[PDB]
Amino acid sequence: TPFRKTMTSASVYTAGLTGILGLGIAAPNLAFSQMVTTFGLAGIVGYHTVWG
């Protein structure tokens, strides 16, 4: 049914956003936050460039 498509998609996004906050809670310093940011952005570049 068209309810469960959006429900599953919204469940995936709320799991991802609470995982981002969970990585935020255990952060000891700003160096780890910097490495998480450059890690995520390099991951999206890597996802996007090897379909090419």
What does the binding site for ligand PC1 look like in residue numbers (CB under 6 A)? Answer: 13, 16-17, 20, 36, 40, 43-44, 47, 51-52
8 binds, among ligand PC1, its own copies, none (CB under 5 to 8 A by kind): none
Q: Is 44 in the site for its own copies (CB under 8 A)?
A: yes
- Assess contact for 23 and 37: CB atoms under 8 A: no
Instruction: Compute CA 31 distance to the chain's CA centroid, rounded to the nearest angstrom.
Output: 18
Segment 1 to 20, residues that bind its own copies, using CB under 8 A: 2-3, 5-7, 9-11, 13-14, 17-18, 20
Smallest distance, its own copies to C-beta of residue 16, A: 8
CA 24 to CA 32: how far, in whole Å? 9
- Spatial neighbors of 33 by CB under 8 A, at least 6 apart, are 24, 27
